[PDB]
Amino acid sequence: ENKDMCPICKTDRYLSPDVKFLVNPECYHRICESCVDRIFSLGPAQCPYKGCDKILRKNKFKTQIFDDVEVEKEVDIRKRVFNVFNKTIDDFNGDLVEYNKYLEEVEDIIYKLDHGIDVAKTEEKLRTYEELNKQLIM
Amino acid sequence: MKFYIDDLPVLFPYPKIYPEQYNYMCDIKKTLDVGGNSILEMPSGTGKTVSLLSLTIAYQMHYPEHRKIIYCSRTMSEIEKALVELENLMDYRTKELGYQEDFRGLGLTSRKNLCLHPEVSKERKGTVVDEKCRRMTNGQAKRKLEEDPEANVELCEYHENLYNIEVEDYLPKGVFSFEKLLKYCEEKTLCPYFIVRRMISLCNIIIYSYHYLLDPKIAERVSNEVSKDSIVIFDEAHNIDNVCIESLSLDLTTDALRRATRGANALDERISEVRKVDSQKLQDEYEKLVQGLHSADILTDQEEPFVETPVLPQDLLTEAIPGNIRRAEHFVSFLKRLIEYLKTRMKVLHVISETPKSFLQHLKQLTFIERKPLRFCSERLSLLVRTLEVTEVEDFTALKDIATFATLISTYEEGFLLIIEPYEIENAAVPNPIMRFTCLDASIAIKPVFERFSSVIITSGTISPLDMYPRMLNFKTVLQKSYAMTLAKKSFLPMIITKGSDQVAISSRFEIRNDPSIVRNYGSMLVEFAKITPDGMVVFFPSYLYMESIVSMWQTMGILDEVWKHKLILVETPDAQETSLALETYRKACSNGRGAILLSVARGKVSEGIDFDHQYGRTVLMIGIPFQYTESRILKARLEFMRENYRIRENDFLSFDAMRHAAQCLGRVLRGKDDYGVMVLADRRFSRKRSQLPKWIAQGLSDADLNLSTDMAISNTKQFLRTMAQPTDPKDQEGVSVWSYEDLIKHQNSRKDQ
Numbered sequence: 001e002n003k004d005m006c007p008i009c010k011t012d013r014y015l016s017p018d019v020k021f022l023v024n025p026e027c028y029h030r031i032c033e034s035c036v037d038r039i040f041s042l043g044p045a046q047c048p049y050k051g052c053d054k055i056l057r058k059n060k061f062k063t064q065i066f067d068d069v070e071v072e073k074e075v076d077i078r079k080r081v082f083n084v085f086n087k088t089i090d091d092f093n094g095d096l097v098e099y100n101k102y103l104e105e106v107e108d109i110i111y112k113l114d115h116g117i118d119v120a121k122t123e124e125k126l127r128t129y130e131e132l133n134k135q136l137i138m
Numbered sequence: 139m140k141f142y143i144d145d146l147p148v149l150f151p152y153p154k155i156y157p158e159q160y161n162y163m164c165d166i167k168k169t170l171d172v173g174g175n176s177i178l179e180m181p182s183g184t185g186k187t188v189s190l191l192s193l194t195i196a197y198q199m200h201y202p203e204h205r206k207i208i209y210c211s212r213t214m215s216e217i218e219k220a221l222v223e224l225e226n227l228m229d230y231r232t233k234e235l236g237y238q239e240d241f242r243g244l245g246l247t248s249r250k251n252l253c254l255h256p257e258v259s260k261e262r263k264g265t266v267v268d269e270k271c272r273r274m275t276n277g278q279a280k281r282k283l284e285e286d287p288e289a290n291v292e293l294c295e296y297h298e299n300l301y302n303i304e305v306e307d308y309l310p311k312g313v314f315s316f317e318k319l320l321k322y323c324e325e326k327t328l329c330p331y332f333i334v335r336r337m338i339s340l341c342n343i344i345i346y347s348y349h350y351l352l353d354p355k356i357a358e359r360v361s362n363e364v365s366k367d368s369i370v371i372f373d374e375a376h377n378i379d380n381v382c383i384e385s386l387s388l389d390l391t392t393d394a395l396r397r398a399t400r401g402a403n404a405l406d407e408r409i410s411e412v413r414k415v416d417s418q419k420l421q422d423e424y425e426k427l428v429q430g431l432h433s434a435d436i437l438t439d440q441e442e443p444f445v446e447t448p449v450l451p452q453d454l455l456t457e458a459i460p461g462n463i464r465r466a467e468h469f470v471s472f473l474k475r476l477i478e479y480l481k482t483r484m485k486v487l488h489v490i491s492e493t494p495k496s497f498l499q500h501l502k503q504l505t506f507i508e509r510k511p512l513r514f515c516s517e518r519l520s521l522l523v524r525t526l527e528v529t530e531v532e533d534f535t536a537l538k539d540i541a542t543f544a545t546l547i548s549t550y551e552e553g554f555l556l557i558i559e560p561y562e563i564e565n566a567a568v569p570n571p572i573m574r575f576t577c578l579d580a581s582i583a584i585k586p587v588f589e590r591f592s593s594v595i596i597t598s599g600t601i602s603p604l605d606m607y608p609r610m611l612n613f614k615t616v617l618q619k620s621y622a623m624t625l626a627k628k629s630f631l632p633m634i635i636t637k638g639s640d641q642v643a644i645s646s647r648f649e650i651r652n653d654p655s656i657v658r659n660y661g662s663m664l665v666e667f668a669k670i671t672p673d674g675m676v677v678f679f680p681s682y683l684y685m686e687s688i689v690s691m692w693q694t695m696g697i698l699d700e701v702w703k704h705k706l707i708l709v710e711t712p713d714a715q716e717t718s719l720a721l722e723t724y725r726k727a728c729s730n731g732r733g734a735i736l737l738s739v740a741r742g743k744v745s746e747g748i749d750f751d752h753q754y755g756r757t758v759l760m761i762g763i764p765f766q767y768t769e770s771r772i773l774k775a776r777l778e779f780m781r782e783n784y785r786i787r788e789n790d791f792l793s794f795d796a797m798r799h800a801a802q803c804l805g806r807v808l809r810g811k812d813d814y815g816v817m818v819l820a821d822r823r824f825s826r827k828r829s830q831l832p833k834w835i836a837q838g839l840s841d842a843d844l845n846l847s848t849d850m851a852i853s854n855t856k857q858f859l860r861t862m863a864q865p866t867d868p869k870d871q872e873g874v875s876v877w878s879y880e881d882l883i884k885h886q887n888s889r890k891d892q
């Protein structure tokens with residue numbers, strides 16, 4: 001933000017923040033167009049975000065600008081939960097309490113995924129999402 | 139005096155009376171007979187409080203039904219004025235009759251001025267002083283004190299000696315004025331805060347600021363025992379419609395959004411750290427959420443409540459489980475999802491007034507969070523925080539506003555408005571967006587108080603016309619009548635200086651800036667008063683920024699030394715502490731031989747609560763028309779709402795509202811009929827609004843006083859002062875306007891029974 005925006009244009013809050021300081025879905029850090037365009041043009045290269053080593057992938061990025069990437073990732077985890085539970089049976093019978101209980105489980109899957117303090121259900125949530133995907137695919 | 143209104147003794151504390159008072163007395167009992175609203179205009183020059191209290195106090199002591207009486211004033215400063223006035227009348231009522239009171243009547247200002255603990259009293263911020271004693275004397279802190287012997291938790295000990303002696307009875311028999319209360323409570327090392335807190339169900343009359351009636355976050359402890367069958371009294375309530383909308387107003391700043399993230403992230407740490415230690419209670423509280431809203435201990439809280447009820451007092455409340463939000467980690471997650479969405483909605487490049495629905499739906503489109511559970515933020519936060527038993531609030535101060543806001547907007551729609559400025563125009567071209575939000579109809583909060591009671595009293599010396607407010611607050615009164623000042627002498631010269639010495643139509647509407655053609659004319663116009671006027675002279679700018687604008691160049695002008703060469707000059711200061719010191723010294727200088735001259739803003743706080751007697755109020759100045767559209771169309775937004783909701787346009791309301799605020803200041807020049815003072819005004823448009831004035835003020839305004847020049851006006855006021863300075867004591871025609879002691883009111887009014 002104020003001083004964490006780019007390995008090149010770090011103080012980009014007042015440096016005409018017009019270039020997309022986008023976030024690679026597998027890097028989770030602010031990378032300016034001066035930096036990211038140097039990277040994905042040749043392919044999956046890592047960026048020097050204060051000496052970072054996470055790979056900036058190919059032309060598959062997403063828009064995250066100024067939306068609290070960490071919370072946005074938690075929102076994305078919630079969105080991933082929202083995507084995993086896009087076709088989840090919550091009100092298939094109309095029961096609100098069951099939907100209320102079902103909503104808690106999906107949020108817990110996001111909560112397990114988006115927390116990372118002692119994330120072990122997070123891997124299970126992916127398996128549960130895979131189980132949900134197994135339910136979704138079948 | 140002791141006369142009758144055909145039904146009740148009237149133990150009037152003063153030997154003298156006034157013709158308005160009996161007419162005032164005639165209607166109050168008549169209204170008291172038929173519990174209604176009965177908006178009435180009583181001139182501020184007369185002390186309506188005496189006519190107010192005397193008939194009401196007798197009414198409770200004569201009619202044995204209305205054992206509880208409620209008066210809501212604008213300021214606690216008025217309360218102490220009422221507190222002593224009742225005390226004097228209560229002494230007089232005993233004085234005329236002996237001892238027939240057995241009465242309980244006290245004021246209500248705040249914990250800040252009633253927390254008698256010196257350390258908590260030493261703290262400056264009202265939030266902290268409330269929070270500190272709340273924490274210092276807390277339902278859980280005392281457990282940390284009593285259950286675990288430790289110095290970690292201290293106590294006010296005023297709340298303790300409250301529980302020792304005070305929570306068995308009341309203060310012995312006094313109708314304690316704030317000075318008398320504080321003097322008594324300190325000697326008893328008692329807490330007048332917790333005293334009135336428990337004395338809610340005990341005071342036979344209660345006096346407090348409108349907010350304790352209006353502000354639901356403090357109008358929540360309402361006990362129907364003292365409320366239902368009671369009477370509500372209002373004076374100078376004209377400048378309260380704004381307060382009502384202000385009470386539902388809410389300004390936001392992205393710094394506070396970061397402060398919200400500061401608190402909200404700290405919540406994640408707070409919930410996690412206790413979760414490792416004791417999440418079983420949190421799990422238990424989840425069951426406490428599973429059974430319902432946990433009203434068992436979210437309301438039954440002696441000193442526990444962290445988040446109050448910012449929304450109207452629990453009227454629009456659901457109590458079921460919040461679905462998935464039951465989990466605190468989930469609860470914060472949507473909140474964290476929200477604040478950034480709020481930030482994403484705060485970062486708007488321009489000003490947007492977003493509808494409560496479309497914005498909510500837009501949120502749903504962005505973050506699929508439901509409206510009904512969103513109201514639960516206030517209850518959940520108050521519930522969760524105490525379970526977290528947090529030791530601080532400053533990081534969480536931003537959060538309760540969200541718990542306020544998120545509940546509010548989720549509860550409110552099509553009567554409120556969310557508007558997101560990208561900056562402030564006064565400091566534009568810089569990023570400071572505000573997600574401003576407020577209500578639109580003041581009667582929305584007035585409707586429950588409309589609903590709860592029938593006997594309600596509203597009065598003002600300023601209200602004009604008495605018909606906008608029934609239109610504004612959408613209600614029916616009984617008597618819509620204005621009282622005129624029965625004065626056989628002028629005692630005030632209303633002067634409309636449309637034309638200056640230059641005979642220039644002079645105005646404040648032209649700009650919020652300076653033009654010496656108008657300004658230096660004003661400066662030249664002003665100085666001549668300083669020489670002729672005695673100690674006591676105030677100005678009222680339309681805007682504080684406008685106030686400062688004219689100050690510096692007049693300081694640059696040579697106009698400044700001469701008034702100092704004539705009298706003393708005291709300024710309006712952003713901190714009331716220096717302003718108060720100025721005010722008392724100004725009055726001290728007004729009391730002193732060296733003359734004192736003041737300068738304020740028509741919208742300033744001095745016009746809200748501070749009255750000035752003959753010496754203290756001598757020459758009031760209205761610096762142009764007090765106008766408010768220096769600010770944005772948020773005025774227009776509500777006005778456009780007003781225009782569509784009510785068939786009242788801007789200027790008609792503006793002239794009504796501006797002259798209301800104009801007359802709001804002017805009521806402070808007078809103390810009694812002995813008081814006097816010329817009322818000068820300087821604006822071109824002032825001539826047009828002769829109709830908008832209150833009756834007695836309009837009656838006191840002759841048509842020859844319109845668009846006058848200052849020079850001719852100087853001659854006009856010149857003779858006025860000497861005549862008023864002359865001891866005009868006919869002692870025979872006074873009784874016409876005095877209705878001589880206990881006789882003419884008895885004689886004349888009984889003669890006038892036809």
Ligand code: SF4
Pocket residue numbers: 249252253254255256258270271272274275293294295296297298328329330331332
């Ligand atoms: S215990 Fe009483 S005196 Fe002490 S801080 Fe609380 S309200 Fe104030």
Ligand SMILES: [Zn+2]
Pocket residue numbers: 006007008009010032034035
């Ligand atoms: Zn860069």
